Amino acid sequence: XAXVXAXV
Amino acid sequence: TXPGVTXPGV
DNA sequence: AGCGCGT
DNA sequence: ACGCGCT
Ligand SMILES: *C(=O)c1cnc2ccccc2n1
């Protein structure tokens, strides 16, 4: 759930 | 949800 | 608490 | 450099 490179 | 962002639900 | 990811 | 999302 976090979006720092991919945001899933 | 999803997965991701299971379901809902299951 | 274990699912779903890649710049 | 990192956690989110309801039935
Ligand atoms: C988001 O909160 C989150 C947590 N863990 C993960 C593992 C693998 C891919 C994506 C993920 N996203």
Side-chain angles (χ1 to χ4, degrees):
Chain A
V4 318
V8 331
Chain B
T1 60
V5 96
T6 57
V10 90

mmCIF file of all heavy atoms in Angstrom:
data_model
loop_
_atom_site.group_PDB
_atom_site.id
_atom_site.type_symbol
_atom_site.label_atom_id
_atom_site.label_comp_id
_atom_site.label_asym_id
_atom_site.label_seq_id
_atom_site.Cartn_x
_atom_site.Cartn_y
_atom_site.Cartn_z
ATOM 1 N N UNK A 1 0.743 -1.304 0.000
ATOM 2 C CA UNK A 1 0.000 0.000 0.000
ATOM 3 C C UNK A 1 0.737 1.293 0.000
ATOM 4 O O UNK A 1 0.065 2.301 -0.337
ATOM 5 C CB UNK A 1 -0.987 -0.150 -1.127
ATOM 6 N N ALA A 2 2.001 1.327 0.372
ATOM 7 C CA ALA A 2 2.761 2.570 0.373
ATOM 8 C C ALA A 2 3.231 2.889 -1.048
ATOM 9 O O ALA A 2 3.426 1.980 -1.854
ATOM 10 C CB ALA A 2 3.944 2.465 1.332
ATOM 11 N N UNK A 3 3.404 4.171 -1.367
ATOM 12 C CA UNK A 3 3.810 4.554 -2.682
ATOM 13 C C UNK A 3 5.076 5.421 -2.662
ATOM 14 O O UNK A 3 4.980 6.627 -2.762
ATOM 15 C CB UNK A 3 2.686 5.298 -3.412
ATOM 16 N N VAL A 4 6.252 4.802 -2.555
ATOM 17 C CA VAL A 4 7.486 5.597 -2.531
ATOM 18 C C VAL A 4 8.318 5.538 -3.795
ATOM 19 O O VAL A 4 9.173 6.633 -4.079
ATOM 20 C CB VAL A 4 8.331 5.511 -1.248
ATOM 21 C CG1 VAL A 4 7.463 5.541 0.009
ATOM 22 C CG2 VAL A 4 9.297 4.335 -1.244
ATOM 23 N N UNK A 5 8.134 3.007 -4.899
ATOM 24 C CA UNK A 5 8.348 3.425 -6.241
ATOM 25 C C UNK A 5 7.087 3.049 -6.983
ATOM 26 O O UNK A 5 6.452 3.913 -7.648
ATOM 27 C CB UNK A 5 8.360 4.916 -6.110
ATOM 28 N N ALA A 6 6.679 1.814 -6.772
ATOM 29 C CA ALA A 6 5.376 1.223 -7.065
ATOM 30 C C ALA A 6 4.413 1.536 -5.919
ATOM 31 O O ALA A 6 4.823 1.573 -4.757
ATOM 32 C CB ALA A 6 5.501 -0.272 -7.268
ATOM 33 N N UNK A 7 3.139 1.762 -6.234
ATOM 34 C CA UNK A 7 2.155 2.092 -5.206
ATOM 35 C C UNK A 7 0.977 1.113 -5.205
ATOM 36 O O UNK A 7 -0.112 1.376 -5.720
ATOM 37 C CB UNK A 7 1.588 3.498 -5.414
ATOM 38 N N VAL A 8 1.210 -0.155 -4.559
ATOM 39 C CA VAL A 8 0.088 -1.001 -4.490
ATOM 40 C C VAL A 8 -0.588 -1.079 -3.246
ATOM 41 O O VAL A 8 -1.971 -1.170 -3.519
ATOM 42 C CB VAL A 8 -0.027 -2.284 -5.307
ATOM 43 C CG1 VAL A 8 0.795 -1.842 -6.426
ATOM 44 C CG2 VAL A 8 0.495 -3.637 -4.783
ATOM 45 N N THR B 1 -8.741 -5.023 0.315
ATOM 46 C CA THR B 1 -9.214 -5.116 -1.063
ATOM 47 C C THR B 1 -8.238 -5.899 -1.924
ATOM 48 O O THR B 1 -7.125 -6.208 -1.498
ATOM 49 C CB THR B 1 -9.415 -3.722 -1.703
ATOM 50 O OG1 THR B 1 -8.171 -3.009 -1.710
ATOM 51 C CG2 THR B 1 -10.459 -2.913 -0.950
ATOM 52 N N UNK B 2 -8.664 -6.218 -3.141
ATOM 53 C CA UNK B 2 -7.774 -6.808 -4.133
ATOM 54 C C UNK B 2 -7.594 -8.318 -3.984
ATOM 55 O O UNK B 2 -8.555 -9.077 -4.107
ATOM 56 C CB UNK B 2 -8.225 -6.467 -5.574
ATOM 57 N N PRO B 3 -6.353 -8.758 -3.703
ATOM 58 C CA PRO B 3 -5.185 -7.920 -3.406
ATOM 59 C C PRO B 3 -4.502 -7.340 -4.642
ATOM 60 O O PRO B 3 -4.365 -8.028 -5.654
ATOM 61 C CB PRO B 3 -4.234 -8.887 -2.682
ATOM 62 C CG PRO B 3 -4.883 -10.253 -2.748
ATOM 63 C CD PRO B 3 -5.988 -10.179 -3.743
ATOM 64 N N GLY B 4 -4.068 -6.087 -4.545
ATOM 65 C CA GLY B 4 -4.246 -5.302 -3.358
ATOM 66 C C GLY B 4 -5.221 -4.152 -3.582
ATOM 67 O O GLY B 4 -5.878 -4.108 -4.580
ATOM 68 N N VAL B 5 -5.290 -3.243 -2.609
ATOM 69 C CA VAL B 5 -6.102 -2.034 -2.711
ATOM 70 C C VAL B 5 -7.507 -2.255 -3.198
ATOM 71 O O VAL B 5 -8.462 -1.226 -3.080
ATOM 72 C CB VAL B 5 -5.405 -0.973 -3.563
ATOM 73 C CG1 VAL B 5 -5.874 -0.996 -5.013
ATOM 74 C CG2 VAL B 5 -5.596 0.417 -2.967
ATOM 75 N N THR B 6 -8.245 -9.702 0.668
ATOM 76 C CA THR B 6 -8.897 -9.959 -0.613
ATOM 77 C C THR B 6 -10.275 -9.317 -0.688
ATOM 78 O O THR B 6 -10.903 -9.050 0.335
ATOM 79 C CB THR B 6 -9.058 -11.476 -0.889
ATOM 80 O OG1 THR B 6 -9.786 -12.093 0.181
ATOM 81 C CG2 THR B 6 -7.709 -12.165 -1.057
ATOM 82 N N UNK B 7 -10.737 -9.075 -1.909
ATOM 83 C CA UNK B 7 -12.110 -8.634 -2.136
ATOM 84 C C UNK B 7 -12.261 -7.124 -2.296
ATOM 85 O O UNK B 7 -11.620 -6.517 -3.153
ATOM 86 C CB UNK B 7 -12.736 -9.352 -3.357
ATOM 87 N N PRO B 8 -13.098 -6.504 -1.448
ATOM 88 C CA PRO B 8 -13.766 -7.118 -0.293
ATOM 89 C C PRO B 8 -15.016 -7.927 -0.636
ATOM 90 O O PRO B 8 -15.847 -7.482 -1.430
ATOM 91 C CB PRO B 8 -14.138 -5.910 0.563
ATOM 92 C CG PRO B 8 -14.378 -4.827 -0.427
ATOM 93 C CD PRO B 8 -13.429 -5.073 -1.573
ATOM 94 N N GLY B 9 -15.152 -9.097 -0.018
ATOM 95 C CA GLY B 9 -14.183 -9.595 0.916
ATOM 96 C C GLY B 9 -13.540 -10.882 0.412
ATOM 97 O O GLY B 9 -13.583 -11.141 -0.753
ATOM 98 N N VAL B 10 -12.953 -11.659 1.325
ATOM 99 C CA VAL B 10 -12.282 -12.911 0.978
ATOM 100 C C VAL B 10 -11.394 -12.804 -0.233
ATOM 101 O O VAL B 10 -10.690 -13.926 -0.715
ATOM 102 C CB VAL B 10 -13.266 -14.078 0.839
ATOM 103 C CG1 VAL B 10 -13.805 -14.230 -0.579
ATOM 104 C CG2 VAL B 10 -12.652 -15.393 1.315
ATOM 105 P P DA C 1 -0.811 -8.755 13.636
ATOM 106 O OP1 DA C 1 -0.107 -7.973 14.678
ATOM 107 O OP2 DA C 1 -2.221 -8.440 13.315
ATOM 108 O "O5'" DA C 1 0.023 -8.727 12.269
ATOM 109 C "C5'" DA C 1 1.121 -9.612 12.083
ATOM 110 C "C4'" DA C 1 1.154 -10.147 10.664
ATOM 111 O "O4'" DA C 1 1.645 -11.508 10.697
ATOM 112 C "C3'" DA C 1 -0.204 -10.275 10.009
ATOM 113 O "O3'" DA C 1 -0.045 -10.567 8.626
ATOM 114 C "C2'" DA C 1 -0.708 -11.510 10.729
ATOM 115 C "C1'" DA C 1 0.538 -12.390 10.617
ATOM 116 N N9 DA C 1 0.659 -13.393 11.667
ATOM 117 C C8 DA C 1 -0.284 -13.730 12.595
ATOM 118 N N7 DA C 1 0.100 -14.678 13.418
ATOM 119 C C5 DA C 1 1.383 -14.985 12.997
ATOM 120 C C6 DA C 1 2.335 -15.914 13.458
ATOM 121 N N6 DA C 1 2.122 -16.732 14.493
ATOM 122 N N1 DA C 1 3.521 -15.968 12.814
ATOM 123 C C2 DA C 1 3.729 -15.145 11.780
ATOM 124 N N3 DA C 1 2.910 -14.233 11.257
ATOM 125 C C4 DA C 1 1.743 -14.205 11.916
ATOM 126 P P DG C 2 0.302 -9.437 7.535
ATOM 127 O OP1 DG C 2 1.114 -8.367 8.153
ATOM 128 O OP2 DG C 2 -0.967 -9.089 6.853
ATOM 129 O "O5'" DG C 2 1.214 -10.243 6.497
ATOM 130 C "C5'" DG C 2 2.115 -11.237 6.994
ATOM 131 C "C4'" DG C 2 2.321 -12.371 5.999
ATOM 132 O "O4'" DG C 2 2.343 -13.640 6.709
ATOM 133 C "C3'" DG C 2 1.241 -12.524 4.944
ATOM 134 O "O3'" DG C 2 1.795 -13.128 3.789
ATOM 135 C "C2'" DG C 2 0.255 -13.459 5.631
ATOM 136 C "C1'" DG C 2 1.198 -14.404 6.371
ATOM 137 N N9 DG C 2 0.620 -14.952 7.599
ATOM 138 C C8 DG C 2 -0.524 -14.527 8.228
ATOM 139 N N7 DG C 2 -0.801 -15.196 9.310
ATOM 140 C C5 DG C 2 0.220 -16.130 9.408
ATOM 141 C C6 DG C 2 0.448 -17.132 10.381
ATOM 142 O O6 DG C 2 -0.232 -17.402 11.383
ATOM 143 N N1 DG C 2 1.598 -17.862 10.107
ATOM 144 C C2 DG C 2 2.424 -17.651 9.031
ATOM 145 N N2 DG C 2 3.489 -18.458 8.934
ATOM 146 N N3 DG C 2 2.222 -16.716 8.110
ATOM 147 C C4 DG C 2 1.105 -15.995 8.362
ATOM 148 P P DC C 3 2.033 -12.263 2.457
ATOM 149 O OP1 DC C 3 2.840 -13.084 1.526
ATOM 150 O OP2 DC C 3 2.512 -10.920 2.859
ATOM 151 O "O5'" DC C 3 0.566 -12.103 1.849
ATOM 152 C "C5'" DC C 3 -0.156 -13.246 1.419
ATOM 153 C "C4'" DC C 3 -1.091 -12.871 0.288
ATOM 154 O "O4'" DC C 3 -2.311 -12.318 0.836
ATOM 155 C "C3'" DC C 3 -0.515 -11.845 -0.681
ATOM 156 O "O3'" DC C 3 -0.168 -12.509 -1.935
ATOM 157 C "C2'" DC C 3 -1.591 -10.757 -0.815
ATOM 158 C "C1'" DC C 3 -2.523 -11.002 0.378
ATOM 159 N N1 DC C 3 -2.352 -10.053 1.547
ATOM 160 C C2 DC C 3 -2.746 -8.713 1.429
ATOM 161 O O2 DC C 3 -3.205 -8.310 0.357
ATOM 162 N N3 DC C 3 -2.600 -7.889 2.499
ATOM 163 C C4 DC C 3 -2.099 -8.359 3.643
ATOM 164 N N4 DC C 3 -1.975 -7.510 4.669
ATOM 165 C C5 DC C 3 -1.705 -9.720 3.786
ATOM 166 C C6 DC C 3 -1.858 -10.523 2.729
ATOM 167 P P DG C 4 -0.902 -12.206 -3.339
ATOM 168 O OP1 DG C 4 -2.371 -12.300 -3.197
ATOM 169 O OP2 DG C 4 -0.242 -13.092 -4.320
ATOM 170 O "O5'" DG C 4 -0.486 -10.704 -3.691
ATOM 171 C "C5'" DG C 4 -0.984 -10.099 -4.871
ATOM 172 C "C4'" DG C 4 -0.717 -8.605 -4.871
ATOM 173 O "O4'" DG C 4 -1.052 -8.047 -3.586
ATOM 174 C "C3'" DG C 4 0.739 -8.205 -5.130
ATOM 175 O "O3'" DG C 4 0.838 -7.552 -6.388
ATOM 176 C "C2'" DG C 4 1.093 -7.255 -3.970
ATOM 177 C "C1'" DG C 4 -0.272 -6.903 -3.399
ATOM 178 N N9 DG C 4 -0.268 -6.556 -1.973
ATOM 179 C C8 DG C 4 -0.921 -5.495 -1.391
ATOM 180 N N7 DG C 4 -0.755 -5.424 -0.100
ATOM 181 C C5 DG C 4 0.058 -6.507 0.201
ATOM 182 C C6 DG C 4 0.571 -6.940 1.448
ATOM 183 O O6 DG C 4 0.402 -6.432 2.565
ATOM 184 N N1 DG C 4 1.356 -8.081 1.317
ATOM 185 C C2 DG C 4 1.613 -8.726 0.131
ATOM 186 N N2 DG C 4 2.392 -9.814 0.206
ATOM 187 N N3 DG C 4 1.136 -8.335 -1.046
ATOM 188 C C4 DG C 4 0.370 -7.220 -0.938
ATOM 189 P P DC C 5 2.023 -7.933 -7.405
ATOM 190 O OP1 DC C 5 1.401 -8.318 -8.694
ATOM 191 O OP2 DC C 5 2.913 -8.889 -6.708
ATOM 192 O "O5'" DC C 5 2.816 -6.554 -7.597
ATOM 193 C "C5'" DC C 5 3.176 -5.777 -6.464
ATOM 194 C "C4'" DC C 5 4.257 -4.775 -6.817
ATOM 195 O "O4'" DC C 5 4.726 -4.130 -5.602
ATOM 196 C "C3'" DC C 5 5.493 -5.377 -7.487
ATOM 197 O "O3'" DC C 5 5.957 -4.525 -8.520
ATOM 198 C "C2'" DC C 5 6.498 -5.468 -6.347
ATOM 199 C "C1'" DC C 5 6.125 -4.256 -5.507
ATOM 200 N N1 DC C 5 6.505 -4.403 -4.073
ATOM 201 C C2 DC C 5 6.036 -3.490 -3.123
ATOM 202 O O2 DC C 5 5.297 -2.567 -3.481
ATOM 203 N N3 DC C 5 6.407 -3.648 -1.829
ATOM 204 C C4 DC C 5 7.209 -4.657 -1.482
ATOM 205 N N4 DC C 5 7.548 -4.772 -0.198
ATOM 206 C C5 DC C 5 7.697 -5.590 -2.436
ATOM 207 C C6 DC C 5 7.325 -5.427 -3.705
ATOM 208 P P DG C 6 6.872 -5.112 -9.703
ATOM 209 O OP1 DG C 6 6.011 -5.937 -10.579
ATOM 210 O OP2 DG C 6 8.088 -5.700 -9.095
ATOM 211 O "O5'" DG C 6 7.316 -3.811 -10.512
ATOM 212 C "C5'" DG C 6 6.773 -2.546 -10.162
ATOM 213 C "C4'" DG C 6 7.880 -1.550 -9.871
ATOM 214 O "O4'" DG C 6 8.218 -1.592 -8.459
ATOM 215 C "C3'" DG C 6 9.184 -1.806 -10.631
ATOM 216 O "O3'" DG C 6 9.678 -0.601 -11.167
ATOM 217 C "C2'" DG C 6 10.117 -2.354 -9.557
ATOM 218 C "C1'" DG C 6 9.617 -1.623 -8.330
ATOM 219 N N9 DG C 6 9.964 -2.295 -7.087
ATOM 220 C C8 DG C 6 10.900 -3.287 -6.928
ATOM 221 N N7 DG C 6 11.012 -3.700 -5.702
ATOM 222 C C5 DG C 6 10.093 -2.936 -5.000
ATOM 223 C C6 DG C 6 9.775 -2.944 -3.628
ATOM 224 O O6 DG C 6 10.254 -3.652 -2.736
ATOM 225 N N1 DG C 6 8.790 -2.007 -3.322
ATOM 226 C C2 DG C 6 8.190 -1.175 -4.235
ATOM 227 N N2 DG C 6 7.261 -0.337 -3.755
ATOM 228 N N3 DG C 6 8.481 -1.159 -5.528
ATOM 229 C C4 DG C 6 9.440 -2.066 -5.838
ATOM 230 P P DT C 7 10.772 -0.632 -12.342
ATOM 231 O OP1 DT C 7 10.079 -1.011 -13.592
ATOM 232 O OP2 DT C 7 11.929 -1.434 -11.886
ATOM 233 O "O5'" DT C 7 11.228 0.895 -12.454
ATOM 234 C "C5'" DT C 7 10.239 1.912 -12.556
ATOM 235 C "C4'" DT C 7 10.575 3.090 -11.660
ATOM 236 O "O4'" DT C 7 10.529 2.678 -10.277
ATOM 237 C "C3'" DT C 7 11.969 3.656 -11.843
ATOM 238 O "O3'" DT C 7 11.981 4.580 -12.925
ATOM 239 C "C2'" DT C 7 12.208 4.353 -10.505
ATOM 240 C "C1'" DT C 7 11.425 3.474 -9.520
ATOM 241 N N1 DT C 7 12.288 2.573 -8.706
ATOM 242 C C2 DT C 7 12.525 2.880 -7.387
ATOM 243 O O2 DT C 7 12.062 3.863 -6.837
ATOM 244 N N3 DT C 7 13.328 1.989 -6.728
ATOM 245 C C4 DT C 7 13.907 0.846 -7.246
ATOM 246 O O4 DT C 7 14.615 0.105 -6.573
ATOM 247 C C5 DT C 7 13.619 0.584 -8.634
ATOM 248 C C7 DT C 7 14.191 -0.628 -9.307
ATOM 249 C C6 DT C 7 12.833 1.448 -9.289
ATOM 250 P P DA D 1 16.878 5.293 3.572
ATOM 251 O OP1 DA D 1 16.827 5.092 5.039
ATOM 252 O OP2 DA D 1 16.618 6.631 2.996
ATOM 253 O "O5'" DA D 1 15.897 4.240 2.872
ATOM 254 C "C5'" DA D 1 14.540 4.147 3.285
ATOM 255 C "C4'" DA D 1 13.697 5.216 2.614
ATOM 256 O "O4'" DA D 1 14.232 5.505 1.301
ATOM 257 C "C3'" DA D 1 12.229 4.846 2.435
ATOM 258 O "O3'" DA D 1 11.422 5.714 3.216
ATOM 259 C "C2'" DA D 1 11.940 5.017 0.940
ATOM 260 C "C1'" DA D 1 13.313 5.152 0.295
ATOM 261 N N9 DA D 1 13.793 3.946 -0.381
ATOM 262 C C8 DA D 1 14.522 2.927 0.166
ATOM 263 N N7 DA D 1 14.835 1.982 -0.687
ATOM 264 C C5 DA D 1 14.279 2.412 -1.878
ATOM 265 C C6 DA D 1 14.262 1.857 -3.167
ATOM 266 N N6 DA D 1 14.841 0.693 -3.473
ATOM 267 N N1 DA D 1 13.618 2.540 -4.133
ATOM 268 C C2 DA D 1 13.038 3.703 -3.823
ATOM 269 N N3 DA D 1 12.991 4.328 -2.649
ATOM 270 C C4 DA D 1 13.636 3.623 -1.709
ATOM 271 P P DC D 2 10.791 5.195 4.598
ATOM 272 O OP1 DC D 2 9.934 6.276 5.135
ATOM 273 O OP2 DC D 2 11.899 4.648 5.414
ATOM 274 O "O5'" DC D 2 9.857 3.975 4.158
ATOM 275 C "C5'" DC D 2 8.835 4.177 3.195
ATOM 276 C "C4'" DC D 2 7.781 3.099 3.303
ATOM 277 O "O4'" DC D 2 7.733 2.345 2.078
ATOM 278 C "C3'" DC D 2 8.041 2.047 4.362
ATOM 279 O "O3'" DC D 2 7.675 2.529 5.690
ATOM 280 C "C2'" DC D 2 7.173 0.886 3.879
ATOM 281 C "C1'" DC D 2 7.200 1.060 2.350
ATOM 282 N N1 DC D 2 8.020 0.033 1.638
ATOM 283 C C2 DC D 2 7.922 -0.090 0.248
ATOM 284 O O2 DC D 2 7.164 0.664 -0.373
ATOM 285 N N3 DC D 2 8.665 -1.032 -0.383
ATOM 286 C C4 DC D 2 9.471 -1.827 0.321
ATOM 287 N N4 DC D 2 10.186 -2.740 -0.344
ATOM 288 C C5 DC D 2 9.582 -1.719 1.739
ATOM 289 C C6 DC D 2 8.844 -0.786 2.350
ATOM 290 P P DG D 3 6.145 2.778 6.142
ATOM 291 O OP1 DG D 3 5.421 3.524 5.090
ATOM 292 O OP2 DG D 3 6.208 3.368 7.495
ATOM 293 O "O5'" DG D 3 5.539 1.309 6.337
ATOM 294 C "C5'" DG D 3 4.215 1.136 6.839
ATOM 295 C "C4'" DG D 3 3.184 1.555 5.806
ATOM 296 O "O4'" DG D 3 3.583 1.075 4.502
ATOM 297 C "C3'" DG D 3 1.797 0.987 6.016
ATOM 298 O "O3'" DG D 3 0.853 1.793 5.344
ATOM 299 C "C2'" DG D 3 1.920 -0.382 5.357
ATOM 300 C "C1'" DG D 3 2.836 -0.082 4.169
ATOM 301 N N9 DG D 3 3.774 -1.160 3.882
ATOM 302 C C8 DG D 3 4.272 -2.076 4.775
ATOM 303 N N7 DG D 3 5.100 -2.927 4.237
ATOM 304 C C5 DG D 3 5.158 -2.548 2.904
ATOM 305 C C6 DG D 3 5.890 -3.105 1.832
ATOM 306 O O6 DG D 3 6.660 -4.073 1.854
ATOM 307 N N1 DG D 3 5.661 -2.423 0.639
ATOM 308 C C2 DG D 3 4.828 -1.341 0.502
ATOM 309 N N2 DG D 3 4.733 -0.816 -0.727
ATOM 310 N N3 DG D 3 4.132 -0.808 1.501
ATOM 311 C C4 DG D 3 4.347 -1.461 2.668
ATOM 312 P P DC D 4 -0.537 2.171 6.049
ATOM 313 O OP1 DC D 4 -0.403 3.540 6.598
ATOM 314 O OP2 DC D 4 -0.913 1.046 6.936
ATOM 315 O "O5'" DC D 4 -1.564 2.221 4.831
ATOM 316 C "C5'" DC D 4 -1.104 2.591 3.542
ATOM 317 C "C4'" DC D 4 -2.154 2.298 2.484
ATOM 318 O "O4'" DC D 4 -1.947 0.978 1.933
ATOM 319 C "C3'" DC D 4 -3.591 2.328 2.971
ATOM 320 O "O3'" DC D 4 -4.426 2.831 1.946
ATOM 321 C "C2'" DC D 4 -3.888 0.859 3.284
ATOM 322 C "C1'" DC D 4 -3.016 0.117 2.273
ATOM 323 N N1 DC D 4 -2.423 -1.143 2.803
ATOM 324 C C2 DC D 4 -2.254 -2.240 1.952
ATOM 325 O O2 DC D 4 -2.618 -2.151 0.776
ATOM 326 N N3 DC D 4 -1.699 -3.373 2.443
ATOM 327 C C4 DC D 4 -1.317 -3.429 3.718
ATOM 328 N N4 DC D 4 -0.777 -4.569 4.158
ATOM 329 C C5 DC D 4 -1.477 -2.321 4.601
ATOM 330 C C6 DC D 4 -2.025 -1.208 4.104
ATOM 331 P P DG D 5 -5.919 3.305 2.286
ATOM 332 O OP1 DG D 5 -6.262 4.407 1.360
ATOM 333 O OP2 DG D 5 -6.003 3.511 3.750
ATOM 334 O "O5'" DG D 5 -6.799 2.030 1.913
ATOM 335 C "C5'" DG D 5 -6.599 1.384 0.666
ATOM 336 C "C4'" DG D 5 -7.593 0.257 0.489
ATOM 337 O "O4'" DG D 5 -6.960 -1.004 0.824
ATOM 338 C "C3'" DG D 5 -8.831 0.374 1.367
ATOM 339 O "O3'" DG D 5 -9.993 0.059 0.624
ATOM 340 C "C2'" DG D 5 -8.580 -0.626 2.495
ATOM 341 C "C1'" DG D 5 -7.685 -1.668 1.835
ATOM 342 N N9 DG D 5 -6.726 -2.270 2.761
ATOM 343 C C8 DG D 5 -6.341 -1.777 3.984
ATOM 344 N N7 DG D 5 -5.462 -2.524 4.594
ATOM 345 C C5 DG D 5 -5.248 -3.580 3.718
ATOM 346 C C6 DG D 5 -4.396 -4.703 3.839
ATOM 347 O O6 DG D 5 -3.641 -4.998 4.776
ATOM 348 N N1 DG D 5 -4.480 -5.533 2.725
ATOM 349 C C2 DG D 5 -5.283 -5.306 1.633
ATOM 350 N N2 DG D 5 -5.229 -6.220 0.655
ATOM 351 N N3 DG D 5 -6.087 -4.256 1.508
ATOM 352 C C4 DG D 5 -6.018 -3.438 2.585
ATOM 353 P P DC D 6 -11.423 0.608 1.107
ATOM 354 O OP1 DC D 6 -12.380 0.378 0.004
ATOM 355 O OP2 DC D 6 -11.233 1.976 1.647
ATOM 356 O "O5'" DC D 6 -11.791 -0.345 2.338
ATOM 357 C "C5'" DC D 6 -13.098 -0.335 2.881
ATOM 358 C "C4'" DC D 6 -13.885 -1.539 2.401
ATOM 359 O "O4'" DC D 6 -13.215 -2.761 2.813
ATOM 360 C "C3'" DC D 6 -15.298 -1.637 2.951
ATOM 361 O "O3'" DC D 6 -16.140 -2.208 1.976
ATOM 362 C "C2'" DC D 6 -15.129 -2.558 4.157
ATOM 363 C "C1'" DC D 6 -14.065 -3.521 3.653
ATOM 364 N N1 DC D 6 -13.234 -4.124 4.739
ATOM 365 C C2 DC D 6 -12.686 -5.399 4.565
ATOM 366 O O2 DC D 6 -12.907 -6.012 3.516
ATOM 367 N N3 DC D 6 -11.926 -5.929 5.553
ATOM 368 C C4 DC D 6 -11.710 -5.237 6.671
ATOM 369 N N4 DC D 6 -10.954 -5.800 7.618
ATOM 370 C C5 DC D 6 -12.258 -3.935 6.867
ATOM 371 C C6 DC D 6 -13.005 -3.422 5.885
ATOM 372 P P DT D 7 -17.714 -1.908 2.006
ATOM 373 O OP1 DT D 7 -18.061 -1.164 0.775
ATOM 374 O OP2 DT D 7 -18.018 -1.320 3.329
ATOM 375 O "O5'" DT D 7 -18.365 -3.364 1.935
ATOM 376 C "C5'" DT D 7 -18.053 -4.216 0.844
ATOM 377 C "C4'" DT D 7 -17.997 -5.665 1.285
ATOM 378 O "O4'" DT D 7 -16.894 -5.853 2.182
ATOM 379 C "C3'" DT D 7 -19.198 -6.141 2.077
ATOM 380 O "O3'" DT D 7 -20.216 -6.591 1.190
ATOM 381 C "C2'" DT D 7 -18.628 -7.295 2.916
ATOM 382 C "C1'" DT D 7 -17.111 -7.041 2.904
ATOM 383 N N1 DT D 7 -16.508 -6.894 4.265
ATOM 384 C C2 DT D 7 -15.649 -7.865 4.724
ATOM 385 O O2 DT D 7 -15.351 -8.853 4.077
ATOM 386 N N3 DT D 7 -15.148 -7.641 5.979
ATOM 387 C C4 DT D 7 -15.415 -6.565 6.803
ATOM 388 O O4 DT D 7 -14.916 -6.454 7.920
ATOM 389 C C5 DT D 7 -16.324 -5.582 6.262
ATOM 390 C C7 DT D 7 -16.687 -4.371 7.065
ATOM 391 C C6 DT D 7 -16.821 -5.792 5.032
HETATM 392 C C1 LIG E 1 1.145 -1.888 1.101
HETATM 393 O O1 LIG E 1 0.772 -1.525 2.203
HETATM 394 C C2 LIG E 1 1.925 -3.126 0.838
HETATM 395 C C3 LIG E 1 2.436 -3.960 1.834
HETATM 396 N N1 LIG E 1 3.161 -5.037 1.501
HETATM 397 C C4 LIG E 1 3.384 -5.317 0.207
HETATM 398 C C5 LIG E 1 4.138 -6.446 -0.143
HETATM 399 C C6 LIG E 1 4.366 -6.732 -1.469
HETATM 400 C C7 LIG E 1 3.855 -5.907 -2.462
HETATM 401 C C8 LIG E 1 3.108 -4.793 -2.119
HETATM 402 C C9 LIG E 1 2.874 -4.497 -0.775
HETATM 403 N N2 LIG E 1 2.146 -3.402 -0.436
#
